[PDB]
């Protein structure tokens, strides 16, 4: 099955998921000089005051912080979006070293990591129906750079020892994702896809310009996770990022001048 190795990594995904070579794949390089300011874009509305995290999961590809999405409790609206998108999970992608890890790039710059907050359009009723629609998901992407610690991330880092290997989960209630957000909500937006199989072309991407800072210690704890299951040969969970894909017939729009 798919993964991030030599034998099963991104460059192989098209054989089981031919949409890998589609017209609206993610991530992409954001060329800041050609992304056009669009005055018609709105401010993003991120409303996470009632977000109810439940659990953290090592799925063998990353770890997922999961939310109760059975009501409108943590929603993303505005920005480029029509309608209301409910938070279902967040996860990250990161590198073996601080010089790579992000999926999106900015003028070819790779960040140490990238956080994805995944939301589904309530007009489709559930996540599985939403991913079948071109406007089914909104993913908020936030770059991580290594410097100062992010106090709001520490609760996540400290639970990782308990989900070292694939298929482990742990209760993870009361975590507030507002602690992961940068000061500015300036963004770039474009139409794209999931970045892991099945690579469905169902995402409005909203990539924040301003990175968050996390400490080296924090990212080092991400890199102690395992792709493998309990008791199998240890292969560290690192470099779980898809590289930039062809932009094709897309425009990247900026919310800011
Ligand atoms: O389980 C999976 O890998 C598919 C999946 C599910 C939810 C979000 C995703 N994304 O690319 O942001 C991908
Ligand atoms: Zn992701």
- Domain borders along the chain are 1-257
Strands 105-106 and 29-30: parallel
SS3 at position 171? strand
* C-alpha dihedral (106, 119, 194, 239), degrees to nearest 10: 60
SS3 at position 154? helix
How is 58-83 classified by DSSP, letter by letter?
A: E-SSSEEEEE--SSS-SEEEETT-SS
Place of tokens 């190795």: 5
- Contact assessment for residue 212 and residue 182, using Cβ atoms and an 8 Å cutoff: yes
Atom number of ligand 1 nearest to Cα 193: 11
Cα–Cα distance measured from residue 206 to residue 81, given in angstroms and rounded to the nearest whole number: 10
What 95-101 contacts at long range (C-beta under 8 Å, 24+ apart), as own/partner pairs, is 95/238, 95/239, 95/241, 96/223, 96/236, 96/238, 96/239, 98/146, 98/216, 98/219, 100/239, 100/241, 101/144, 101/239, 101/241
Q: How far is the CA of 143 from the centre of ligand 1 (A)?
A: 18
Cα–Cα distance measured from residue 119 to residue 79, given in angstroms and rounded to the nearest whole number: 14
In angstroms, what CA-CA distances link 190 with 108, 121, 201?
A: 17, 16, 12
- Contact assessment for residue 219 and residue 146, using Cβ atoms and an 8 Å cutoff: yes
Backbone angles phi, psi at 179, to 5 degrees: -65, -5
14 catalytic per annotation: no
Q: How far is the CA of 117 from the centre of ligand 1 (A)?
A: 10
In angstroms, what CA-CA distances link 10 with 2, 20, 21, 146, 242?
A: 8, 9, 11, 25, 6
Q: Copy the structure tokens of residue 181.
A: 């957000």
CATH number (3.10.200.10, 1.10.3720.10, 3.30.70.1150, 3.40.50.1000) of 1-257 reads 3.10.200.10
Identify the residues whose C-beta falls under 6 Å from ligand 1: 116, 118, 139, 194-196
Atom number of ligand 1 nearest to Cα 196: 3
Give binding residues for substrate as ranges: 195-196
In angstroms, what CA-CA distances link 175 with 225, 234, 242?
A: 20, 29, 27
Q: In the 8-state DSSP scheme, what is residue 10?
A: G
Place of tokens 């991120």: 46
In angstroms, what CA-CA distances link 80 with 43, 44, 156, 209, 221?
A: 8, 8, 30, 15, 35
Ligand 1 probe mutation, 194, 195, 240, most atoms within 8 A of CB: 194
> Within a 13 Å sphere around the CA of 77, how many CA atoms are in the beta-carbon half?
10
Interior angle at CA 175, CA 174 and CA 177, nearest 5: 140
> Within a 13 Å sphere around the CA of 109, how many CA atoms are in the beta-carbon half?
11
Place of tokens 């507002």: 178
Which residues are bridge partners to 78 per DSSP? Answer: 44
Cα–Cα distance measured from residue 82 to residue 207, given in angstroms and rounded to the nearest whole number: 17
Q: Catalytic: which of 1, 7, 12, 61? A: 61
Q: Which of 255, 257, 246 lies closest to 192, judged by CA?
A: 246
Q: How many CB atoms lie within 10 A of CB 47?
A: 16
Q: How far is the CA of 174 from the centre of ligand 1 (A)?
A: 23
Burial class (CB in 10 A: 0-12, 13-18, 19+), 148: exposed
**Closest ligand to Cα 91:** 2
SS3 at position 253? strand
In angstroms, what CA-CA distances link 91 with 34, 231, 253?
A: 29, 24, 24
Cα–Cα distance measured from residue 130 to residue 125, given in angstroms and rounded to the nearest whole number: 7
Q: Copy the structure tokens of residue 238.
A: 């690192």
Q: Copy the structure tokens of residue 110.
A: 């790779």
Cα–Cα distance measured from residue 172 to residue 75, given in angstroms and rounded to the nearest whole number: 19
* C-alpha dihedral (110, 116, 122, 126), degrees to nearest 10: 120
**Closest ligand to Cα 94:** 2
After which residues do gaps appear in the chain, with C to N over 2.5 Å?
A: none
């Amino acid at each position: 099955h798919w993964g991030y190795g030599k034998h099963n990594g991104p460059e192989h995904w098209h054989k089981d998921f031919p949409i890998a070579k589609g017209e609206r794949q993610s991530p992409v390089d954001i060329d800041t000089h050609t992304a056009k300011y669009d005055p018609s874009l709105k401010p993003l509305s991120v409303s996470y005051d009632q977000a109810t995290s439940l659990r953290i999961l090592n799925n063998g590809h990353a770890f997922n912080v999961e939310f109760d999405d059975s009501q409108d409790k943590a929603v993303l609206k505005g920005g480029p979006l029509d309608g209301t998108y409910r938070l279902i999970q967040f996860h990250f992608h990161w590198g073996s070293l601080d010089g790579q890890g992000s999926e999106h790039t900015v003028d070819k710059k790779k960040y140490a990591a990238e956080l994805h907050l995944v939301h589904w359009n309530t007009k489709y009723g559930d996540f599985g129906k939403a991913v079948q629609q071109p406007d089914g998901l909104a993913v908020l992407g936030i770059f991580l750079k290594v410097g100062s610690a992010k106090p709001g991330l520490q609760k996540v880092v400290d639970v990782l020892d308990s989900i070292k290997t694939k298929g482990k989960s742990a209760d993870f209630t009361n975590f507030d994702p507002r602690g992961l957000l940068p000061e500015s909500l300036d963004y770039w937006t474009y139409p794209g896809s999931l970045t892991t199989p099945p690579l469905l072309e169902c995402v409005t991407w909203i990539v924040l310009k301003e990175p968050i800072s996390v400490s080296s210690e924090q990212v080092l704890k991400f890199r102690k996770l395992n792709f493998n299951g309990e008791g199998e040969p240890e292969e560290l969970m690192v470099d779980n990022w898809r590289p930039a894909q062809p932009l094709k017939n897309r425009q990247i729009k900026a919310s800011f001048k």
